[PDB]
Design a protein around this ligand. Structure first.
Ligand SMILES: [Cl-]
Length: 240
């Protein structure tokens, strides 16, 4: 009784978050990033930011629902990439992950599929990894090491003025989404909103223990989001 946010409603919620926090670029979720290509996707966005900062053309392709001029403006302004990752345990490649996702979508079934969020905070030079199921993909200390290596590539790809290094944070210390099959999308957008309000958010440590109470507060958050996006344009990037 707090249902599944698909890629559509996650996208709209991100558009809405942009209008509150312009630094956030509302990256599309169709087709989404995966465990296999999220690094390439991020690198490619930051190379496009660098290009735009130099008045150069961009490479990486246009988002489907965004004009070229508007995308450039977003890339210029953005200080935060919300990368939504669609995962399933069975597929072993990008090609198979894509094929699996298309199969469950064309059946409208859920499966063992799951949303993760990686936040690239460019201002703070911080990678934040949020898994509402704690270790659905791999243990957190292993994700940490994998992301620290990634963080060193980003130091080369997107240097700071003073060689300040990208740091890594694993957000969830425990399973957050307790006894719920479907709430992973919503949790991702809740955590993102907390982070936009306060990048040093302790909101995950401050949760109620009671799983039901927790999911009621989330149901609140979800209704407030659904109200705010009701009138907002469909399949259409906000103008930066
Ligand atoms: Cl932006």
């Amino acid at each position: 009784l707090v249902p599944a946010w698909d890629s559509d409603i996650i996208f709209k919620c991100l558009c809405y978050f942009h209008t509150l926090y312009p630094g956030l670029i509302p990256l599309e979720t169709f087709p989404p990033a995966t465990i296999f290509n999220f690094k390439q996707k991020i690198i490619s966005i930051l190379e496009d930011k660098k290009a735009v900062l130099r008045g150069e053309p961009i490479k990486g392709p246009l988002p489907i629902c965004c004009s070229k001029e508007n995308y450039r403006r977003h890339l210029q302004r953005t200080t935060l990439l919300p990368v939504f990752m669609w995962y399933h345990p069975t597929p072993k490649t990008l090609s198979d992950t894509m094929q699996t996702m298309k199969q469950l979508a064309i059946k409208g079934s859920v499966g063992a599929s799951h949303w993760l969020l990686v936040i690239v905070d460019i201002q703070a030079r911080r990678l934040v990894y949020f898994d509402s199921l704690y270790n659905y993909v791999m243990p957190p200390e292993n994700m940490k090491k994998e992301l620290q290596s990634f963080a060193q590539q980003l130091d080369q790809v997107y240097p700071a003025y003073d060689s300040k290094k990208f740091s890594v944070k694993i957000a969830a210390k425990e399973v957050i989404q307790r006894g719920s099959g479907s709430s992973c999308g919503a949790w991702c957008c809740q955590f993102l909103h907390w982070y936009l309000k306060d990048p040093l958010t302790d909101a995950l440590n401050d949760l109620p223990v009671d799983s039901v109470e927790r999911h009621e507060n989330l149901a609140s958050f979800v209704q407030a989001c659904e109200a705010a996006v009701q009138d907002l344009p469909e399949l259409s990037w906000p103008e930066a």
